[model samples]
Target: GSMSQFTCEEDFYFPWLLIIIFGIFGLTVMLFVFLFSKQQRIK
Candidate 1:
């Protein structure tokens, strides 16, 4: 095993997983805004 900077060792790419999770959150927010704007424009 290797020393973990996160202090909770598991595997590598810990930060990468966090990045991917946040990316999905951002994408979800973007999709919600896009749909809301489209609806507002149509109404």
Candidate 2:
């Protein structure tokens, strides 16, 4: 049925959405930590 096909396509598609969301969240978190915790060099 066409409805089942839609479900199949949705299953295939949702993982990319999850990956994109986590990828962005991870990038921002990494940037925030690096900014806050990295040491500054003395002059």
Candidate 3:
């Protein structure tokens, strides 16, 4: 059925969505830490 195919595709996409979310979150945290350190160095 078409609905079954959609569910299969969604299952495949789920991991990718998680990876993308975590990837962005990791980058944001790294950038925040870098900026915090830079500000501390200036003090």
Candidate 4:
């Protein structure tokens, strides 16, 4: 049925959504870490 297909589509892409969310968060944090460390080094 259409309802089942909708849910199946959601399930298939759910992991990709999670991975993208985490990847963005992780890269942002890593960028801040790099920037802050560089800041302190300049002190």
Candidate 5:
């Protein structure tokens, strides 16, 4: 008995995922800076 199976390749080509990842990272950094500055002002 012989059988053949067909397979298709899937590709993900989008910067949206990367953009979101970086955006979150940037926001986290900004928030940390803001908090640090605020803490310094309290002194």
Candidate 6:
């Protein structure tokens, strides 16, 4: 089966879901830090 294939019969979905969630969270945090630091310097 393809790694991207959705399988309701298996437990592999959790790891993939976690990867997606963490990836998005990390990106959001990084962007926030970059923007916040830049704003702080402008003040």
Best by TM-score: 6
Q: Which candidate, 2 or 6, would have the higher TM-score against the true structure?
A: 6
Number of the top lDDT candidate: 6
At residue 1, candidate 4 shows an lDDT of 38
lDDT of 1 by residue, 1-27 (tens): 887575356555657888998999999
Reference-based TM-score of each model: 0.54, 0.52, 0.58, 0.58, 0.55, 0.59
Residue 18, candidate 4: alpha-carbon lDDT: 88
User: Lowest summed-lDDT stretch of 10 residues in model 4?
Assistant: 1-10
lDDT by residue for model 2 (3-43), tens:
54355655575568889989999999999988877665555
Output the worst ten-in-a-row residue range by lDDT, candidate 2.
1-10
Question: Which runs of model 5 end up more than 4 angstroms from their true locations?
Answer: 1-13
Q: For each candidate, what is the lDDT?
A: 0.83, 0.78, 0.81, 0.81, 0.83, 0.83
Point out the higher-scoring one by lDDT: 1 or 4.
1
Count of clashes, each model: 0, 0, 0, 0, 0, 0
Off by over 4 Å in 3: 1-14
Q: Write candidate 5's Cα lDDT for 1-43 as tens digits.
A: 9999645464545687998899999999999999998889644
Q: Which whole-number lDDT from 0 to 100 does residue 12 have in model 1?
A: 58
TM-score, candidate number 2: 0.52
How does model 5 fare in lDDT?
0.83
What are the clashing pairs of model 3?
A: none
lDDT assessment of candidate 2: 0.78
Best of the two (1, 4) by TM-score: 4
Question: Per-candidate RMSD vs. true structure?
Answer: 5.8, 4.5, 4.2, 4.2, 6.5, 7.3
